Amino acid sequence: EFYDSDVVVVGAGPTGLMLAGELRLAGVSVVVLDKLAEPIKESRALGFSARTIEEFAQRGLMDRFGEVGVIPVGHFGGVPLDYQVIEGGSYGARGIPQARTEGILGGWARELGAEVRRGYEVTAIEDTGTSVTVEAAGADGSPLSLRARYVVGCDGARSSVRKLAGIDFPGTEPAIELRFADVAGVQLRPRFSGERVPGGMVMVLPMGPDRCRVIYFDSSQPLRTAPEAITFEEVADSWQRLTGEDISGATPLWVSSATDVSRQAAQYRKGRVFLAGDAAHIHLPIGAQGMSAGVQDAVNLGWKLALDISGRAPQGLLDTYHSERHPVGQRILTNTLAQRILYLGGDEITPMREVLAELMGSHVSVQRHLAGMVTGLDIRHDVGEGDHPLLGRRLPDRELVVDGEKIPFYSLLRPGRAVLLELGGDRGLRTAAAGWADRVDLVAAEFDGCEAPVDGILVRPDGYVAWVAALGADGLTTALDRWFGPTA
Protein backbone atom coordinates (compact mmCIF):
# COMPACT_ATOMS: atom_id res chain seq x y z
CA GLU A 1 0.00 0.00 0.00
CA PHE A 2 2.79 2.36 -1.16
CA TYR A 3 2.20 6.08 -1.87
CA ASP A 4 2.58 8.02 -5.13
CA SER A 5 3.93 10.97 -3.20
CA ASP A 6 4.27 11.89 0.40
CA VAL A 7 2.43 15.15 -0.40
CA VAL A 8 -0.10 16.01 -3.11
CA VAL A 9 -0.15 19.78 -3.42
CA VAL A 10 -3.19 21.09 -5.31
CA GLY A 11 -2.74 24.16 -7.48
CA ALA A 12 0.39 25.46 -9.19
CA GLY A 13 -0.18 28.99 -8.00
CA PRO A 14 2.56 30.88 -6.19
CA THR A 15 1.53 29.25 -2.91
CA GLY A 16 1.55 25.72 -4.31
CA LEU A 17 4.86 26.10 -6.11
CA MET A 18 6.56 27.70 -3.12
CA LEU A 19 5.32 24.90 -0.88
CA ALA A 20 6.47 22.27 -3.31
CA GLY A 21 9.91 23.86 -3.25
CA GLU A 22 10.06 23.84 0.55
CA LEU A 23 8.83 20.24 0.87
CA ARG A 24 11.14 18.98 -1.86
CA LEU A 25 13.96 21.04 -0.22
CA ALA A 26 13.68 18.99 2.92
CA GLY A 27 13.41 15.68 1.06
CA VAL A 28 9.76 15.00 0.33
CA SER A 29 8.15 13.40 -2.70
CA VAL A 30 5.56 15.90 -3.89
CA VAL A 31 3.18 15.80 -6.84
CA VAL A 32 1.47 19.02 -7.85
CA LEU A 33 -1.94 19.11 -9.50
CA ASP A 34 -3.04 22.13 -11.49
CA LYS A 35 -6.26 22.55 -13.41
CA LEU A 36 -4.51 24.68 -16.02
CA ALA A 37 -2.38 23.11 -18.77
CA GLU A 38 -0.57 26.48 -19.05
CA PRO A 39 -0.03 29.19 -16.42
CA ILE A 40 -2.37 32.14 -16.39
CA LYS A 41 0.16 34.47 -18.07
CA GLU A 42 -1.52 37.31 -16.17
CA SER A 43 0.40 40.20 -14.60
CA ARG A 44 -1.78 40.45 -11.55
CA ALA A 45 0.09 41.79 -8.53
CA LEU A 46 2.87 44.15 -9.51
CA GLY A 47 5.66 43.12 -7.17
CA PHE A 48 5.46 41.65 -3.71
CA SER A 49 6.12 42.72 -0.11
CA ALA A 50 9.53 42.75 1.58
CA ARG A 51 8.93 39.80 3.96
CA THR A 52 8.50 37.89 0.67
CA ILE A 53 11.71 39.31 -0.79
CA GLU A 54 13.31 37.86 2.33
CA GLU A 55 11.63 34.45 1.97
CA PHE A 56 13.02 34.29 -1.54
CA ALA A 57 16.50 35.40 -0.47
CA GLN A 58 16.40 32.83 2.31
CA ARG A 59 16.46 30.17 -0.40
CA GLY A 60 18.79 32.07 -2.77
CA LEU A 61 16.20 32.75 -5.47
CA MET A 62 16.50 36.48 -6.16
CA ASP A 63 18.84 35.89 -9.11
CA ARG A 64 16.08 34.19 -11.09
CA PHE A 65 14.28 37.54 -11.38
CA GLY A 66 16.99 39.85 -12.71
CA GLU A 67 15.75 43.30 -11.57
CA VAL A 68 14.94 43.61 -7.87
CA GLY A 69 14.62 47.36 -7.33
CA VAL A 70 12.65 48.33 -4.24
CA ILE A 71 10.34 51.22 -3.35
CA PRO A 72 11.16 52.99 -0.05
CA VAL A 73 8.04 55.18 0.15
CA GLY A 74 4.75 53.31 0.14
CA HIS A 75 1.43 53.91 1.84
CA PHE A 76 -1.21 52.79 4.30
CA GLY A 77 -4.83 53.46 3.42
CA GLY A 78 -3.49 55.89 0.83
CA VAL A 79 -1.21 57.85 3.17
CA PRO A 80 2.35 57.65 1.76
CA LEU A 81 5.07 57.14 4.30
CA ASP A 82 8.77 56.28 4.31
CA TYR A 83 9.35 52.56 4.80
CA GLN A 84 13.04 52.54 5.44
CA VAL A 85 12.61 53.74 9.06
CA ILE A 86 12.21 50.09 9.99
CA GLU A 87 15.60 48.44 9.76
CA GLY A 88 15.26 46.38 6.58
CA GLY A 89 11.72 47.44 5.75
CA SER A 90 10.54 48.57 2.34
CA TYR A 91 7.31 48.64 0.39
CA GLY A 92 8.53 45.61 -1.59
CA ALA A 93 9.61 44.86 -5.13
CA ARG A 94 8.30 47.20 -7.76
CA GLY A 95 7.87 45.67 -11.14
CA ILE A 96 7.51 41.90 -10.91
CA PRO A 97 4.19 40.67 -12.33
CA GLN A 98 2.63 37.51 -10.86
CA ALA A 99 3.51 35.71 -14.12
CA ARG A 100 7.23 36.11 -13.54
CA THR A 101 6.95 34.96 -9.92
CA GLU A 102 5.04 31.82 -10.83
CA GLY A 103 7.48 31.19 -13.68
CA ILE A 104 10.55 31.10 -11.51
CA LEU A 105 8.78 29.13 -8.79
CA GLY A 106 7.79 26.49 -11.34
CA GLY A 107 11.38 26.40 -12.57
CA TRP A 108 12.75 26.07 -9.04
CA ALA A 109 10.23 23.41 -7.99
CA ARG A 110 10.82 21.15 -10.94
CA GLU A 111 14.57 21.79 -10.71
CA LEU A 112 14.47 20.56 -7.08
CA GLY A 113 12.57 17.39 -8.01
CA ALA A 114 8.87 18.13 -7.62
CA GLU A 115 6.55 16.62 -10.22
CA VAL A 116 4.41 19.47 -11.55
CA ARG A 117 1.45 17.89 -13.37
CA ARG A 118 -0.69 20.31 -15.39
CA GLY A 119 -4.19 19.35 -16.59
CA TYR A 120 -5.00 17.31 -13.46
CA GLU A 121 -8.10 18.65 -11.68
CA VAL A 122 -9.03 17.65 -8.14
CA THR A 123 -12.64 16.51 -7.99
CA ALA A 124 -12.77 14.55 -4.73
CA ILE A 125 -10.99 13.53 -1.53
CA GLU A 126 -11.29 10.93 1.21
CA ASP A 127 -9.32 11.12 4.44
CA THR A 128 -8.39 7.98 6.40
CA GLY A 129 -6.44 7.50 9.59
CA THR A 130 -3.26 6.72 7.68
CA SER A 131 -3.64 8.41 4.29
CA VAL A 132 -5.64 10.50 1.84
CA THR A 133 -6.96 9.29 -1.51
CA VAL A 134 -7.85 12.07 -3.95
CA GLU A 135 -9.84 11.97 -7.17
CA ALA A 136 -8.19 14.00 -9.95
CA ALA A 137 -9.37 14.31 -13.56
CA GLY A 138 -6.27 13.73 -15.66
CA ALA A 139 -6.17 14.78 -19.25
CA ASP A 140 -5.63 11.18 -20.40
CA GLY A 141 -7.93 9.14 -18.19
CA SER A 142 -11.22 10.72 -17.23
CA PRO A 143 -10.61 10.03 -13.54
CA LEU A 144 -7.37 8.98 -11.90
CA SER A 145 -7.21 8.35 -8.15
CA LEU A 146 -4.05 9.22 -6.22
CA ARG A 147 -2.83 8.40 -2.72
CA ALA A 148 -0.60 10.30 -0.33
CA ARG A 149 0.11 10.74 3.25
CA TYR A 150 -1.01 14.37 3.01
CA VAL A 151 -2.91 16.64 0.68
CA VAL A 152 -2.32 20.39 0.83
CA GLY A 153 -4.79 22.76 -0.73
CA CYS A 154 -2.95 25.53 -2.43
CA ASP A 155 -5.75 26.10 -4.93
CA GLY A 156 -7.63 29.36 -5.20
CA ALA A 157 -10.13 31.36 -3.19
CA ARG A 158 -12.74 29.18 -4.85
CA SER A 159 -10.92 26.30 -3.23
CA SER A 160 -12.00 22.77 -4.04
CA VAL A 161 -10.31 20.75 -1.31
CA ARG A 162 -11.84 23.19 1.18
CA LYS A 163 -15.43 22.20 0.44
CA LEU A 164 -15.17 18.43 0.21
CA ALA A 165 -12.54 18.33 2.94
CA GLY A 166 -15.22 19.94 5.14
CA ILE A 167 -13.48 23.20 6.02
CA ASP A 168 -15.69 25.98 7.45
CA PHE A 169 -14.82 29.28 5.77
CA PRO A 170 -16.54 32.25 7.47
CA GLY A 171 -15.96 35.92 6.98
CA THR A 172 -17.04 39.49 6.46
CA GLU A 173 -20.09 40.79 4.64
CA PRO A 174 -19.04 42.71 1.49
CA ALA A 175 -19.21 46.49 1.46
CA ILE A 176 -17.41 47.69 -1.69
CA GLU A 177 -16.94 46.34 -5.21
CA LEU A 178 -13.59 46.64 -7.01
CA ARG A 179 -12.77 45.76 -10.62
CA PHE A 180 -9.42 45.19 -12.29
CA ALA A 181 -8.24 45.29 -15.83
CA ASP A 182 -5.09 45.52 -17.85
CA VAL A 183 -6.63 47.80 -20.48
CA ALA A 184 -4.51 47.73 -23.62
CA GLY A 185 -6.89 48.92 -26.32
CA VAL A 186 -8.40 52.32 -26.95
CA GLN A 187 -6.50 54.16 -24.26
CA LEU A 188 -8.14 56.35 -21.65
CA ARG A 189 -7.66 60.12 -21.43
CA PRO A 190 -8.17 60.79 -17.73
CA ARG A 191 -8.42 64.01 -15.86
CA PHE A 192 -10.46 62.87 -12.81
CA SER A 193 -8.05 60.01 -12.25
CA GLY A 194 -7.98 59.69 -8.46
CA GLU A 195 -11.03 61.45 -7.10
CA ARG A 196 -13.58 60.09 -4.62
CA VAL A 197 -16.51 61.50 -6.57
CA PRO A 198 -20.08 60.45 -5.64
CA GLY A 199 -20.88 57.10 -7.19
CA GLY A 200 -17.39 55.74 -6.65
CA MET A 201 -13.81 56.08 -7.72
CA VAL A 202 -11.36 55.52 -10.52
CA MET A 203 -7.62 54.90 -10.50
CA VAL A 204 -5.18 54.27 -13.33
CA LEU A 205 -1.49 53.42 -13.28
CA PRO A 206 0.54 52.56 -16.42
CA MET A 207 2.66 49.41 -16.72
CA GLY A 208 3.55 49.28 -20.42
CA PRO A 209 3.27 51.97 -23.07
CA ASP A 210 0.44 49.99 -24.62
CA ARG A 211 -1.20 48.69 -21.46
CA CYS A 212 -2.52 50.68 -18.49
CA ARG A 213 -3.85 49.27 -15.17
CA VAL A 214 -7.48 50.13 -14.43
CA ILE A 215 -8.51 49.97 -10.79
CA TYR A 216 -12.09 50.70 -10.60
CA PHE A 217 -14.34 50.57 -7.52
CA ASP A 218 -17.83 52.00 -7.12
CA SER A 219 -19.63 53.43 -4.10
CA SER A 220 -22.50 50.97 -4.04
CA GLN A 221 -23.89 47.88 -2.35
CA PRO A 222 -22.67 44.83 -4.33
CA LEU A 223 -24.96 42.09 -5.60
CA ARG A 224 -22.65 39.29 -6.76
CA THR A 225 -20.52 38.73 -3.67
CA ALA A 226 -18.30 36.07 -5.22
CA PRO A 227 -15.22 37.64 -6.84
CA GLU A 228 -15.31 36.42 -10.43
CA ALA A 229 -14.04 37.11 -13.95
CA ILE A 230 -16.03 39.53 -16.12
CA THR A 231 -15.95 41.11 -19.60
CA PHE A 232 -15.01 44.80 -20.33
CA GLU A 233 -18.70 45.63 -20.49
CA GLU A 234 -19.11 46.25 -16.76
CA VAL A 235 -15.85 48.07 -16.14
CA ALA A 236 -16.43 50.45 -19.05
CA ASP A 237 -20.08 51.16 -18.35
CA SER A 238 -19.49 51.68 -14.61
CA TRP A 239 -16.52 53.93 -15.42
CA GLN A 240 -18.80 56.20 -17.39
CA ARG A 241 -21.34 55.69 -14.60
CA LEU A 242 -18.96 57.63 -12.35
CA THR A 243 -16.88 59.84 -14.60
CA GLY A 244 -19.06 60.38 -17.63
CA GLU A 245 -16.01 59.30 -19.62
CA ASP A 246 -16.52 56.48 -22.08
CA ILE A 247 -13.71 53.94 -22.31
CA SER A 248 -15.93 51.35 -24.00
CA GLY A 249 -13.93 51.16 -27.23
CA ALA A 250 -10.91 49.53 -25.62
CA THR A 251 -9.80 45.90 -25.46
CA PRO A 252 -8.74 44.27 -22.17
CA LEU A 253 -6.29 41.48 -21.47
CA TRP A 254 -8.70 40.32 -18.74
CA VAL A 255 -11.09 42.02 -16.35
CA SER A 256 -12.23 40.82 -12.98
CA SER A 257 -14.71 41.86 -10.31
CA ALA A 258 -13.96 41.45 -6.64
CA THR A 259 -15.51 42.57 -3.37
CA ASP A 260 -14.03 43.51 -0.02
CA VAL A 261 -15.21 40.24 1.34
CA SER A 262 -12.64 38.94 3.83
CA ARG A 263 -12.94 35.26 4.77
CA GLN A 264 -10.73 32.89 6.69
CA ALA A 265 -11.14 29.21 7.48
CA ALA A 266 -11.50 28.36 11.17
CA GLN A 267 -8.90 25.56 11.00
CA TYR A 268 -5.81 25.38 8.81
CA ARG A 269 -5.65 21.64 9.51
CA LYS A 270 -8.57 19.22 9.32
CA GLY A 271 -7.08 15.76 9.73
CA ARG A 272 -4.57 15.37 6.91
CA VAL A 273 -6.01 18.00 4.58
CA PHE A 274 -4.53 21.49 4.55
CA LEU A 275 -5.05 24.97 3.21
CA ALA A 276 -2.27 27.38 2.32
CA GLY A 277 -2.52 30.76 0.66
CA ASP A 278 -5.79 31.95 -0.81
CA ALA A 279 -7.35 28.60 0.01
CA ALA A 280 -7.19 29.60 3.69
CA HIS A 281 -7.96 33.34 3.56
CA ILE A 282 -9.22 35.89 1.06
CA HIS A 283 -9.69 39.65 1.01
CA LEU A 284 -9.74 42.64 -1.31
CA PRO A 285 -6.75 42.01 -3.61
CA ILE A 286 -4.19 44.78 -4.01
CA GLY A 287 -0.62 45.39 -2.86
CA ALA A 288 0.43 41.79 -3.57
CA GLN A 289 -0.75 40.82 -0.09
CA GLY A 290 -2.44 37.61 -1.21
CA MET A 291 0.54 36.19 -3.07
CA SER A 292 2.93 37.39 -0.36
CA ALA A 293 0.79 35.98 2.45
CA GLY A 294 0.41 32.70 0.64
CA VAL A 295 4.07 32.36 -0.07
CA GLN A 296 4.79 32.96 3.60
CA ASP A 297 2.07 30.48 4.64
CA ALA A 298 3.70 27.94 2.38
CA VAL A 299 7.14 28.61 3.72
CA ASN A 300 6.03 28.23 7.35
CA LEU A 301 4.25 25.01 6.39
CA GLY A 302 6.91 23.50 4.12
CA TRP A 303 9.69 22.30 6.39
CA LYS A 304 7.19 21.26 9.09
CA LEU A 305 5.08 19.06 6.76
CA ALA A 306 8.40 17.98 5.14
CA LEU A 307 10.04 16.31 8.06
CA ASP A 308 6.61 15.33 9.40
CA ILE A 309 6.66 12.77 6.60
CA SER A 310 10.14 11.57 7.39
CA GLY A 311 11.10 10.77 10.94
CA ARG A 312 12.01 13.48 13.41
CA ALA A 313 8.50 14.82 13.64
CA PRO A 314 7.71 16.09 17.11
CA GLN A 315 4.43 16.40 18.99
CA GLY A 316 3.39 20.00 18.40
CA LEU A 317 4.42 20.40 14.77
CA LEU A 318 1.85 20.44 11.92
CA ASP A 319 -0.49 22.04 14.43
CA THR A 320 1.91 24.98 14.78
CA TYR A 321 1.09 25.95 11.17
CA HIS A 322 -2.47 26.81 12.19
CA SER A 323 -1.21 28.17 15.52
CA GLU A 324 1.26 30.52 13.77
CA ARG A 325 -0.54 31.56 10.57
CA HIS A 326 -4.20 31.77 11.51
CA PRO A 327 -3.70 34.87 13.70
CA VAL A 328 -1.56 36.31 10.91
CA GLY A 329 -4.49 35.67 8.60
CA GLN A 330 -7.23 37.13 10.76
CA ARG A 331 -4.88 40.09 11.20
CA ILE A 332 -4.17 40.88 7.54
CA LEU A 333 -7.90 40.66 6.82
CA THR A 334 -8.42 43.24 9.58
CA ASN A 335 -5.68 45.53 8.26
CA THR A 336 -6.77 45.39 4.62
CA LEU A 337 -10.33 46.09 5.76
CA ALA A 338 -8.87 49.04 7.68
CA GLN A 339 -6.77 50.44 4.84
CA ARG A 340 -9.59 50.24 2.33
CA ILE A 341 -12.16 51.75 4.66
CA LEU A 342 -9.80 54.68 5.12
CA TYR A 343 -8.90 54.80 1.44
CA LEU A 344 -11.96 53.88 -0.67
CA GLY A 345 -14.53 55.44 1.73
CA GLY A 346 -16.13 58.82 1.11
CA ASP A 347 -16.77 61.82 3.40
CA GLU A 348 -17.00 59.68 6.58
CA ILE A 349 -13.36 58.60 6.37
CA THR A 350 -12.01 62.05 5.39
CA PRO A 351 -11.17 62.53 9.17
CA MET A 352 -9.52 59.18 9.05
CA ARG A 353 -7.07 60.14 6.33
CA GLU A 354 -6.44 63.36 8.21
CA VAL A 355 -5.76 61.71 11.55
CA LEU A 356 -3.45 59.03 10.20
CA ALA A 357 -1.68 61.63 8.04
CA GLU A 358 -0.98 63.42 11.31
CA LEU A 359 0.04 60.24 13.16
CA MET A 360 2.50 59.33 10.36
CA GLY A 361 4.45 62.45 11.28
CA SER A 362 5.68 60.32 14.14
CA HIS A 363 8.11 57.54 13.30
CA VAL A 364 6.88 55.14 15.92
CA SER A 365 3.63 55.16 13.94
CA VAL A 366 5.70 54.92 10.76
CA GLN A 367 7.40 51.70 11.91
CA ARG A 368 4.14 50.33 13.29
CA HIS A 369 2.30 50.65 9.96
CA LEU A 370 5.53 49.61 8.28
CA ALA A 371 5.52 46.27 10.01
CA GLY A 372 1.75 45.97 9.54
CA MET A 373 1.80 46.09 5.71
CA VAL A 374 5.28 44.66 5.02
CA THR A 375 4.55 41.65 7.11
CA GLY A 376 8.30 41.84 7.78
CA LEU A 377 8.18 42.43 11.50
CA ASP A 378 4.68 42.42 12.93
CA ILE A 379 4.82 38.66 12.30
CA ARG A 380 6.35 37.72 15.69
CA HIS A 381 5.24 34.11 16.20
CA ASP A 382 3.59 34.11 19.63
CA VAL A 383 4.51 30.42 20.06
CA GLY A 384 7.90 30.32 21.74
CA GLU A 385 9.68 29.77 25.02
CA GLY A 386 9.07 32.95 27.00
CA ASP A 387 8.51 35.15 23.95
CA HIS A 388 10.39 38.09 25.44
CA PRO A 389 13.46 38.94 23.28
CA LEU A 390 13.04 38.35 19.43
CA LEU A 391 11.61 34.80 19.86
CA GLY A 392 8.89 34.38 17.23
CA ARG A 393 10.41 37.30 15.31
CA ARG A 394 12.49 36.71 12.20
CA LEU A 395 16.24 37.21 11.89
CA PRO A 396 17.48 39.87 9.44
CA ASP A 397 20.48 39.71 7.11
CA ARG A 398 23.84 40.08 8.86
CA GLU A 399 27.39 39.33 7.70
CA LEU A 400 29.43 36.57 9.38
CA VAL A 401 33.17 35.98 9.50
CA VAL A 402 36.08 33.77 8.58
CA ASP A 403 35.85 31.33 11.52
CA GLY A 404 33.34 29.48 9.43
CA GLU A 405 34.23 31.26 6.16
CA LYS A 406 33.36 34.60 4.60
CA ILE A 407 29.76 33.34 4.00
CA PRO A 408 27.02 35.21 5.93
CA PHE A 409 23.77 33.56 7.03
CA TYR A 410 21.21 34.38 4.40
CA SER A 411 23.19 31.74 2.49
CA LEU A 412 22.66 29.44 5.45
CA LEU A 413 18.91 29.05 5.26
CA ARG A 414 19.07 28.07 1.59
CA PRO A 415 18.92 24.27 2.09
CA GLY A 416 15.74 24.49 4.17
CA ARG A 417 17.66 23.30 7.22
CA ALA A 418 18.02 24.97 10.60
CA VAL A 419 21.06 26.75 11.94
CA LEU A 420 22.88 27.65 15.16
CA LEU A 421 25.38 30.50 15.45
CA GLU A 422 28.25 30.35 17.93
CA LEU A 423 31.39 32.39 18.55
CA GLY A 424 34.09 29.72 18.37
CA GLY A 425 33.78 29.43 22.13
CA ASP A 426 30.90 28.01 24.16
CA ARG A 427 32.35 24.68 22.87
CA GLY A 428 30.20 22.81 25.39
CA LEU A 429 27.09 24.41 23.99
CA ARG A 430 28.64 24.27 20.46
CA THR A 431 28.76 20.42 20.46
CA ALA A 432 27.63 18.96 23.80
CA ALA A 433 24.39 20.87 23.24
CA ALA A 434 24.45 20.29 19.47
CA GLY A 435 25.67 16.98 18.06
CA TRP A 436 22.88 17.04 15.47
CA ALA A 437 25.19 18.38 12.75
CA ASP A 438 23.11 16.81 9.98
CA ARG A 439 19.77 17.65 11.64
CA VAL A 440 20.63 21.35 11.90
CA ASP A 441 23.64 23.43 10.94
CA LEU A 442 26.24 24.41 13.52
CA VAL A 443 28.16 27.52 12.51
CA ALA A 444 31.15 29.10 14.25
CA ALA A 445 31.97 32.77 13.67
CA GLU A 446 32.31 36.28 15.11
CA PHE A 447 29.21 37.53 13.30
CA ASP A 448 28.94 41.11 14.64
CA GLY A 449 28.76 43.36 11.56
CA CYS A 450 26.47 46.29 12.62
CA GLU A 451 25.17 47.56 15.92
CA ALA A 452 21.97 45.78 17.05
CA PRO A 453 22.26 42.19 18.59
CA VAL A 454 24.75 39.98 20.50
CA ASP A 455 25.64 36.26 20.56
CA GLY A 456 23.50 33.21 21.44
CA ILE A 457 20.96 32.16 18.77
CA LEU A 458 19.74 29.17 16.74
CA VAL A 459 16.97 29.61 14.17
CA ARG A 460 14.14 27.65 12.47
CA PRO A 461 14.31 26.88 8.72
CA ASP A 462 11.89 29.70 7.84
CA GLY A 463 14.13 32.28 9.49
CA TYR A 464 12.49 32.49 12.90
CA VAL A 465 14.44 32.45 16.14
CA ALA A 466 13.84 29.66 18.63
CA TRP A 467 16.63 30.02 21.20
CA VAL A 468 17.64 33.46 22.43
CA ALA A 469 20.60 33.46 24.79
CA ALA A 470 23.24 35.16 26.89
CA LEU A 471 25.18 33.43 29.69
CA GLY A 472 20.41 32.63 31.45
CA ALA A 473 21.60 30.18 34.12
CA ASP A 474 21.21 26.91 32.20
CA GLY A 475 21.70 26.43 28.49
CA LEU A 476 18.29 25.08 27.53
CA THR A 477 18.54 22.59 24.66
CA THR A 478 14.92 21.45 24.91
CA ALA A 479 13.92 24.10 22.38
CA LEU A 480 15.58 21.67 19.96
CA ASP A 481 12.99 19.16 21.19
CA ARG A 482 10.29 21.80 20.65
CA TRP A 483 11.04 22.05 16.90
CA PHE A 484 13.19 18.97 16.20
CA GLY A 485 13.56 15.43 17.46
CA PRO A 486 15.92 13.67 19.94
CA THR A 487 18.19 11.74 17.59
CA ALA A 488 21.83 10.64 17.77
Ligand X SMILES: Cc1cc2nc3c(=O)[nH]c(=O)nc-3n(C[C@H](O)[C@H](O)[C@H](O)COP(=O)(O)OP(=O)(O)OC[C@H]3O[C@@H](n4cnc5c(N)ncnc54)[C@H](O)[C@@H]3O)c2cc1C
The option from ligand X, a second copy, none interacting with 13 (CB < 5 to 8 A, set by class) reads: ligand X
466 phi and psi angles, rounded to 5 deg:
-120, -25
Nearest to 289 by CA among 52, 1, 32, 33: 52
The option from a second copy, ligand X, none interacting with 98 (CB < 5 to 8 A, set by class) reads: ligand X
Q: Which residues pair with 178 in a beta bridge?
A: 217, 258
The interface mask with ligand X, positions 43-62, x = CB under 6 A, is -xx-----------------
User: Kindly report the CA angle at 7 between 3 and 13, in degrees rounded to 5?
Assistant: 140
Nearest to 33 by CA among 130, 127, 123, 149: 123
In 310-383, which residue ranges form alpha helices assigned H by DSSP? 320-344, 350-359, 363-374
Least Å from the CB of residue 265 to ligand X = 13
Three-state DSSP state, 11 = coil
Is residue 179 within 8 Å of residue 257, measured between CB atoms?
yes
Least Å from the CB of residue 12 to ligand X = 5
Q: Which residues pair with 132 in a beta bridge?
A: 127, 148
How many residues sit in the footprint of ligand X (CB under 6 A)?
Answer: 34
The interface mask with ligand X, positions 303-332, x = CB under 6 A, is ------------------------------
Residue 457 belongs to what H/E stretch?
strand 457-459
Instruction: Report the Cα–Cα distance between both ends of the chain, in Å, rounded.
Output: 30
Least Å from the CB of residue 150 to ligand X = 16
Interface pick for a second copy out of 354, 403, 405, 481 (rule CB under 8 A): 354
Is residue 160 within 8 Å of residue 11, measured between CB atoms?
no
Shorter beta-carbon distance to ligand X: residue 120 or 239:
120
Q: Interface with ligand X includes 19 (CB under 6 A)?
A: no
Is residue 14 within 8 Å of residue 102, measured between CB atoms?
yes
The option from ligand X, a second copy, none interacting with 350 (CB < 5 to 8 A, set by class) reads: a second copy
Interface pick for ligand X out of 53, 61, 288, 395 (rule CB under 6 A): 288
Span interacting with a second copy, options 17-25, 163-171, 198-206, 363-371, rule CB under 8 A: 363-371
Q: Interface with a second copy includes 206 (CB under 8 A)?
A: no
Q: Interface with a second copy includes 233 (CB under 8 A)?
A: no
Least Å from the CB of residue 222 to a second copy = 14
Least Å from the CB of residue 174 to a second copy = 11
Residues preceding chain discontinuities in the chain with C to N over 2.5 Å = 471
Q: Interface with a second copy includes 432 (CB under 8 A)?
A: no
Nearest to 438 by CA among 27, 56, 57: 27
Shorter beta-carbon distance to a second copy: residue 4 or 358:
358
Interface pick for a second copy out of 94, 117, 263, 368 (rule CB under 8 A): 368
Q: Interface with a second copy includes 172 (CB under 8 A)?
A: yes
Shorter beta-carbon distance to a second copy: residue 95 or 327:
327
Q: Cβ of 236: how many Cβ atoms within 10 Å?
A: 24
What does the radius of gyration of the chain's CA atoms come to, in whole angstroms?
Answer: 23
Interface residue list for a second copy (CB under 8 A): 172-173, 175, 334-335, 337-338, 341, 347-352, 354-355, 358-359, 361-365, 368, 372
